[PDB]
RNA sequence: AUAUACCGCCAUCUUCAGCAAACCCUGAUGAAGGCUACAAAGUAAGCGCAAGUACCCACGUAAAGACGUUAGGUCAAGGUGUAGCC
């Protein structure tokens, strides 16, 4: 929900072009078009810092972990 | 796209070589100003529009700044804030917000441990290949003002000065007429004047009585009406100098009032020689050191006198 | 406090008679009504009356009773100039007055969602 | 509506060029003049004969080239040296173009008592500027 | 028309600027005005910084001129002034002593008193309400009433004429009668006042 | 003889600014609409003014000001369609 209390249009256009969306639904949203919903608060100052950091740690184990498999295929050529 | 640009560049440089060869100067010293002069001399375009002139500059000015490609073969854009329409504008907004919060943190730390003008929307959109509206521009200007009002230093100071400009001159003071001596001519000075189709050349002296000579003869025989006399006395009355200044003007063209106003303007512009600048400023703010472009309006083929229509009725 | 409307509107679950029958549905919008303005004043009447009385009492010349007409003119000029200067230069005031722009802006900031 | 010689703005399908695309009041600003001679100044006369010769030459050039021309033709009356400098399309053989140019030059020099030399320009088609 | 915005008005007074070093507010004001020195408009061919004139006299002379005859209006004004001067001096030298000592010979004070006496006090307006025009007394400012009195005097001196009457001595006699609180312009003023008083029961129809 | 066949030249509206190619969404995909900068779906090539030319500059003036109503004025600047005739 933005600053007008209305479901955003990006979640409606994502399912149109066959694009998944992982959103954080609270208690006043529409968790129908979200392919991976999860009930959780998203209005507290100290709470939003947790989800924003967990998404940062997921990058450090996805793109940074890519180098572990690049050396396996580079042994042949 | 780049191939056509390279073709235009090579055509431009071979044309510059040919022009420097036909003119007779060295191609290295053949500057762009000389190129423009040679083009104007060889191609005399006699038009009124300044855009229809034969030019031969670098293709960077003829072709507009083309938008570069932000995505590669993989598909990932090169900029972080690209999936939002405007990229550079939002990046600059994020940067100025970061600078604002940095200044706020610095001010909080300091409290706990105890000529120029802004940019223009047109200039901004010409410098940065990006189009914007008016409300976002006003919001950005307000953010810049909030940045300036805060406690700045050096980094933020130069950051906000990079987005500044420089105004032109603002002192519209006229040139002070010097004192000229032409064959034993003490207190001699001349001036001009053009208003309502009237040209006057007054010769103000500071050693005679209190009379005015118009084309040799006095002003009484040429100005029988007291109106012109008062109009010519007003400048000498505004300076409290009457019986100690003599003038001899040679006015031509126009009626009585037009020539009187021309002589008045000439006297006002010539009196700026034996007095301080505060007096000439007081004379200018009162209505003396200024032009009067009140010329007769051009009559229209359908109106009575450049304003009133003909005989337009209702039935 | 606002009165409840349990059996006011004629609905399917009201086995009685409707008392309130509004023309428009009871659904508020997102804009505030315009403030009342542009009314007839026509002030200063007793002063003009006593001025006409003192004119009719004495002769037509204003030398026998100049104080009354002078005060009437002074009051009329003061009132007119005050009203003109106010309505020309000042429209805000102090805390709590004519506020329609910010009111409708706040109403549009938090509108109503009748479509669930 | 003062409908002049300007191109009407309707549907984007008329390949308008650059000459008559501008408004008729932008001649001395964003355009020029096809003809140029001394008859258009103060103190000179015999302008009617010049206009008649110009319109006759235009009609002759339009009739002898049914589609071989693009836009119009620039006139240069240099006292007694007329030059019908224009353009040419790349659709016919050069022999026919040379034949027509020679015939026109001979006719001009033997009728209007004035030698004429052409300066053809190689263009693919009509100098189109807007597809409006 | 032929003059851009943010321009000031040409000044006329000189003694105020001959020594502007009184206090600090006006000093800072004139300094800030002369700093940027905007393009001040030129002085017209009718205003003069002399002390031997009056702005009311200049306005009356400009209003008297019909069409484009400044010299004619100036000559008529000079004739009227010399006529009233001669009449004042003739009635002064042909008297006794108390009358000569209790009266002055300045025509400016007499003209100002005549203007202040002939100046109206109330004005009626034909308010169209329901299809009828009813006169309602409305207040008027000072300049408007002064202009109304001036135009009434002008139209009385112009229209009201027979065949043998003149114009300079006619206007002089009219001004002398208006100064003595017995004149036709004062009669018209009293008639308008009594007409407004007879219809004083219509003040409730006004809306401002 | 028809401007109720035109090309061409113009008129109050015009003392302002709206209209047309390519997409998407909402009206259950009905005729239609798509405005909220503390922003809820709008991007818009092009046209006319502003932007521009000249005169006394940046004031002012002139020149210009679309898509049309008036089957508006004119086959009677100039030429062409249909009727009757040498
Ligand atoms: Mg109803
Ligand atoms: Mg027109
Ligand atoms: Mg017809
Ligand atoms: Mg414009
Ligand atoms: Mg126009
Ligand atoms: Mg007709
Ligand atoms: Zn939310």
UniProtKB/Swiss-Prot annotation, chain A:
It is linked to Combined oxidative phosphorylation deficiency 36: An autosomal recessive, multisystem disease resulting from deficiencies of mitochondrial respiratory enzyme complexes and mitochondrial dysfunction. Clinical manifestations include sensorineural hearing impairment, mild developmental delay, hypoglycemia, and intellectual disability. It is found in: Mitochondrion. This is Small ribosomal subunit protein uS2m. The chain holds residues 199 to 275 of 296 of the full protein. It comes from the Eukaryota. Belongs to the universal ribosomal protein uS2 family. Required for mitoribosome formation and stability, and mitochondrial translation. Component of the mitochondrial small ribosomal subunit (mt-SSU). Mature mammalian 55S mitochondrial ribosomes consist of a small (28S) and a large (39S) subunit. The 28S small subunit contains a 12S ribosomal RNA (12S mt-rRNA) and 30 different proteins. The 39S large subunit contains a 16S rRNA (16S mt-rRNA), a copy of mitochondrial valine transfer RNA (mt-tRNA(Val)), which plays an integral structural role, and 52 different proteins.
Curated annotation (Swiss-Prot), chain B:
GO terms for biological process: mitochondrial translation. It comes from the Eukaryota. The modification N6-acetyllysine is found at residue 206. GO terms for cellular component: mitochondrial inner membrane; mitochondrial small ribosomal subunit; mitochondrion; nucleolus. It is found in: Mitochondrion. Residues 293-315 are annotated as: Disordered. Keywords: Acetylation, Mitochondrion, Ribonucleoprotein, Ribosomal protein, Transit peptide. GO terms for molecular function: RNA binding; structural constituent of ribosome. Belongs to the universal ribosomal protein uS9 family. Component of the mitochondrial small ribosomal subunit (mt-SSU). Mature mammalian 55S mitochondrial ribosomes consist of a small (28S) and a large (39S) subunit. The 28S small subunit contains a 12S ribosomal RNA (12S mt-rRNA) and 30 different proteins. The 39S large subunit contains a 16S rRNA (16S mt-rRNA), a copy of mitochondrial valine transfer RNA (mt-tRNA(Val)), which plays an integral structural role, and 52 different proteins. This is Small ribosomal subunit protein uS9m. The lineage of its organism: Eukaryota, Metazoa, Chordata, Craniata, Vertebrata. The chain holds residues 70 to 396 of 396 of the full protein.
Swiss-Prot record, chain D:
One of its GO terms (biological process) is mitochondrial translation. It comes from the Eukaryota. GO terms for cellular component: mitochondrial inner membrane; mitochondrial small ribosomal subunit; mitochondrion. Keywords: Mitochondrion, Ribonucleoprotein, Ribosomal protein, Transit peptide. One of its GO terms (molecular function) is structural constituent of ribosome. Its main location: mitochondrion. It is found in: Mitochondrion. Component of the mitochondrial small ribosomal subunit (mt-SSU). Mature mammalian 55S mitochondrial ribosomes consist of a small (28S) and a large (39S) subunit. The 28S small subunit contains a 12S ribosomal RNA (12S mt-rRNA) and 30 different proteins. The 39S large subunit contains a 16S rRNA (16S mt-rRNA), a copy of mitochondrial valine transfer RNA (mt-tRNA(Val)), which plays an integral structural role, and 52 different proteins. Belongs to the universal ribosomal protein uS3 family. This is Small ribosomal subunit protein uS3m. It comes from Homo sapiens (Human).
Curated annotation (Swiss-Prot), chain E:
It holds the Pfam family Ribosomal_S7. It is found in: Mitochondrion. One of its GO terms (molecular function) is structural constituent of ribosome. Gene3D superfamilies: Ribosomal protein S7 domain (1.10.455.10). InterPro entries: Ribosomal_uS7, Ribosomal_uS7_dom, Ribosomal_uS7_dom_sf. Keywords: Acetylation, Disease variant, Mitochondrion, Primary mitochondrial disease, Ribonucleoprotein, Ribosomal protein, Transit peptide. SUPFAM superfamilies: Ribosomal protein S7 (SSF47973). GO terms for cellular component: mitochondrial inner membrane; mitochondrial small ribosomal subunit; mitochondrion; ribosome. GO terms for biological process: mitochondrial translation; ribosomal small subunit assembly; translation. Its main location: mitochondrion. The modification N6-acetyllysine is found at residues 174, 194. Component of the mitochondrial small ribosomal subunit (mt-SSU), essential for mitochondrial protein synthesis. Mature mammalian 55S mitochondrial ribosomes consist of a small (28S) and a large (39S) subunit. The 28S small subunit contains a 12S ribosomal RNA (12S mt-rRNA) and 30 different proteins. The 39S large subunit contains a 16S rRNA (16S mt-rRNA), a copy of mitochondrial valine transfer RNA (mt-tRNA(Val)), which plays an integral structural role, and 52 different proteins. PANTHER family: RIBOSOMAL PROTEIN S7 (PTHR11205). Belongs to the universal ribosomal protein uS7 family. This is Small ribosomal subunit protein uS7m. It comes from Homo sapiens (Human). The gene is MRPS7.
């Amino acid at each position: 929900l933005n600053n007008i209390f209305e479901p955003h249009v990006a979640v409606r256009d994502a399912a149109k072009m066959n694009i998944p969306t992982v959103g954080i639904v609270d208690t006043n949203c529409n968790p129908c078009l979200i392919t991976y919903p999860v009930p959780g608060n998203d209005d507290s100052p100290l709470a939003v810092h947790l989800y924003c950091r967990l998404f940062q740690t997921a990058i450090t184990r996805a793109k940074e972990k890519r180098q572990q498999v690049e050396a396996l295929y580079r042994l042949q050529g | 796209t780049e191939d056509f640009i390279k073709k235009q560049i090579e055509e431009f440089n071979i044309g510059k070589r040919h022009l420097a060869n036909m003119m007779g100067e060295d191609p290295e010293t053949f500057t762009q100003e000389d190129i423009d002069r040679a083009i104007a001399y060889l191609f005399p375009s006699g038009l009124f529009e300044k855009r229809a002139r034969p030019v031969m500059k670098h293709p960077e000015q003829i072709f507009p700044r083309q938008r570069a490609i932000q995505w590669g073969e993989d598909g990932r854009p090169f900029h972080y804030l690209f999936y939002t329409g405007k990229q550079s504008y939002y990046s600059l907004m994020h940067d100025v917000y970061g600078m604002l919060l940095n200044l706020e943190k610095h001010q909080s730390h300091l409290q706990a441990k105890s000529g120029s003008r802004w940019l223009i929307k047109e200039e901004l959109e010409e410098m940065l290949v990006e189009k914007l509206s008016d409300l976002d521009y006003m919001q950005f200007i307000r953010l810049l003002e909030k940045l300036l009002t805060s406690q700045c230093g050096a980094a933020e100071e130069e950051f906000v000065q990079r987005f500044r400009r420089s105004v032109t001159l603002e002192s519209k003071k006229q040139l002070i007429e010097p004192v000229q001596y032409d064959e034993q001519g003490m207190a001699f000075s001349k001036s001009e004047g053009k208003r309502k189709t009237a040209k006057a050349e007054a010769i103000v002296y500071k050693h005679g009585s209190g009379r005015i000579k118009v084309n040799g003869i006095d002003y009484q025989l040429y100005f029988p009406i007291t109106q012109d006399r008062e109009q010519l006395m007003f400048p000498f009355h505004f300076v409290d100098r009457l019986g100690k200044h003599d003038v001899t003007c040679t006015v031509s063209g126009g009626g009585r009032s037009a020539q009187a106003g021309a002589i008045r303007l000439a006297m006002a512009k010539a009196l700026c020689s034996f007095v301080t600048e505060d007096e000439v400023e007081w004379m200018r703010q009162a209505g003396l050191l200024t032009t009067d472009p009140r010329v007769r309006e051009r009559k229209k083929p359908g109106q009575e006198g450049a304003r009133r229509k003909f005989t337009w009725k209702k039935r | 406090a606002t009165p409840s409307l349990r059996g006011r509107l004629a609905r399917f679950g009201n086995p009685r008679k409707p008392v309130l029958k509004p023309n428009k549905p009871l659904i508020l919008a997102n804009r505030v009504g315009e403030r009342r303005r542009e009314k007839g004043e026509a002030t200063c009447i007793t002063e003009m009356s006593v001025m006409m009385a003192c004119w009719k009492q004495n002769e037509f010349r204003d030398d026998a009773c100049r104080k009354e007409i002078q005060g009437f003119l002074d009051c009329a000029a003061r009132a007119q100039e005050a009203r003109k200067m106010r309505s020309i230069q000042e429209t805000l005031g102090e805390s709590g007055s004519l506020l329609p722009n910010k009111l409708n802006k706040l109403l549009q900031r938090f509108p109503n969602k009748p479509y669930l | 509506k003062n409908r002049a010689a300007r191109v009407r703005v309707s549907k984007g399908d008329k390949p308008v060029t650059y000459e008559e695309a501008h408004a008729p009041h932008y001649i001395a600003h964003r355009k020029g003049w096809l003809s140029l001679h001394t008859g258009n100044l103060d103190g000179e006369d015999h302008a009617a004969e010049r206009t008649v010769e110009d319109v006759f030459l235009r009609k002759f050039m339009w009739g002898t080239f049914p589609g071989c021309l693009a836009d119009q033709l620039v006139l240069k009356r240099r006292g007694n040296q007329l030059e019908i400098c224009a353009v040419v399309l790349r659709q016919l053989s050069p022999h026919k173009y040379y034949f027509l140019v020679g015939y026109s030059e001979t006719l001009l020099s033997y009728f209007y008592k004035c030698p004429v030399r052409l300066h053809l320009q190689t263009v693919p088609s009509k100098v189109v500027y807007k597809y409006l | 028309s032929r003059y851009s915005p943010e321009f000031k008005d040409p000044l006329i007074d000189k003694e105020y600027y001959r020594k502007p070093v009184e206090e600090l507010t006006e000093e800072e004001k004139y300094v800030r005005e002369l700093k940027k020195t905007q393009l001040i408009k030129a002085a017209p061919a009718g205003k003069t910084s002399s002390v031997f004139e009056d702005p009311v006299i200049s306005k009356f002379t400009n209003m008297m001129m019909i069409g484009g005859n400044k010299v004619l209006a100036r000559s008529l004004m000079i004739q009227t002034l010399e006529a009233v001067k001669r009449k004042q001096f003739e009635k002064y030298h042909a008297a006794s002593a108390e009358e000569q000592a209790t009266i002055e010979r300045n025509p400016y004070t007499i003209f100002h008193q005549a203007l202040k006496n002939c100046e109206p006090m109330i004005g009626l307006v034909p308010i169209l309400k329901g299809g009828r025009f009813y006169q309602v007394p409305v207040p008027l400012p000072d300049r408007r009433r002064r202009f109304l009195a001036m135009k009434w005097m002008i139209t009385e001196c112009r229209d009201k004429k027979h065949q043998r009457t003149l114009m300079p001595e006619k206007l002089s006699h009219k001004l002398l009668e208006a100064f003595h609180n017995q004149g036709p312009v004062i009669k018209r003023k009293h008639d308008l006042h009594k007409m407004a008083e007879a219809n004083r029961a219509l003040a409730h129809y006004r809306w401002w």
